Design a protein around this ligand. Structure first.
Ligand SMILES: Nc1nc2c(ncn2[C@@H]2O[C@H](COP(=O)(O)OP(=O)(O)O)[C@@H](O)[C@H]2O)c(=O)[nH]1
Ligand SMILES: Nc1nc2c(ncn2[C@@H]2O[C@H](COP(=O)(O)OP(=O)(O)O)[C@@H](O)[C@H]2O)c(=O)[nH]1
Lengths: 178, 178
């Protein structure tokens, strides 16, 4: 369902999705990864101002994509195409925002409904640079990740803490499964 | 509505679309351009087997995209997002297929309805390598192109005849307009 074409030849791509509440740092996290790896990102607009943000890694055969949460709430068909056949997820919350963490069960259900049976998930508590504003203890994140069957890390898009770790670890979980 | 992000910075991209009847050579034409320029193309699946095929040129700031005709017939919202804010079109027919040429008025209406007011269009008679199978005289293509306000070329994706000419000429029409 996701392919790369180059010089007459085709190969598969891993569809990896970053999801979570508006304003948890999904775009920042994707863009920090792009910047870290000297890769461009592409941003396309749907409707008034809803965004699709995409990074392609050629050698590594991964497509990383955000379809904004506010967009997912407005467009059913675009959203189901977005989730359909996703291989892995970064499921993101903000350690400084309790509601974003409370939404995780709901995002978990989203993953199982719409995406591949064996899709691997990493729960990421983002904004770990903002310790002074934390409201979600690390132990809550670790324990939910355990009961939902996800991997778990805290990260910082702003400080480049555990940004690469996330995607390389996700592809590894995917390959190990298959 | 189409942006590139690279190393902390943003710029605009030109959204260029290739449209026309199934099997006129749109994919072949896009892929030949990708191959000519040492660029990858990306192919994403919507529904059972409907494809979105995309080439990005970074330096030149152009996004070239096919959303399969059979897909356009099935998914309204995806299709309107596809056309919305298109800057230019390659409107393709097959010189060996009369129906594909008869559809051109209908594709022309499509362009005006759904896309930018000043969107530039090139009418391309593809498969010009197959002279022995021609059923659409060049003069018909030239005359329709004149009455619809389009540029016009015959081309061959298979033989690499007028493939680059098409996109570089399209961006030029776009810039000249603005
Ligand atoms: N301190 C800090 N702020 C962040 C981090 N990631 C994102 N932000 C900020 O959180 C807000 C939302 O980020 P954004 O990437 O747009 O979130 P999205 O809506 O989930 O895509 C913005 O003001 C970002 O600058 C982080 O790691 N640390
Ligand atoms: N002879 C010739 N055949 C072509 C050319 N372009 C496409 N084709 C063939 O026409 C058929 C449809 O091409 P495709 O690129 O899939 O058309 P699309 O459905 O419009 O994307 C395929 O068998 C292609 O190999 C061309 O320039 N010359």
């Amino acid at each position: 369902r996701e392919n790369l074409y180059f010089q007459g030849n085709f190969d598969y791509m891993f569809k990896l999705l970053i999801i979570g509440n508006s304003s948890v740092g999904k775009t920042s996290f994707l863009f920090r990864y792009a910047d870290d790896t000297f890769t461009p990102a592409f941003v396309s607009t749907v409707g008034i101002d809803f965004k699709v943000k995409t990074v392609y890694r050629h050698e590594k055969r991964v497509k990383l994509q955000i379809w904004d949460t506010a967009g997912q709430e407005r467009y059913r068909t675009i959203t189901t195409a977005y989730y359909r056949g996703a291989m892995g997820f970064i499921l993101m919350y903000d350690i400084t925002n309790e509601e974003s963490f409370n939404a995780v069960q709901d995002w978990a259900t989203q993953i199982k409904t719409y995406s591949w049976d064996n899709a691997q998930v990493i729960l990421v508590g983002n904004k770990c640079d903002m310790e002074e504003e934390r409201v979600v203890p690390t132990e809550k994140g670790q324990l939910l990740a355990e009961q939902l069957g996800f991997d778990f890390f805290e990260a910082s898009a702003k400080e480049n803490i555990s940004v690469r770790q996330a995607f390389e670890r996700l592809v590894d979980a995917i390959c190990d499964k298959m």
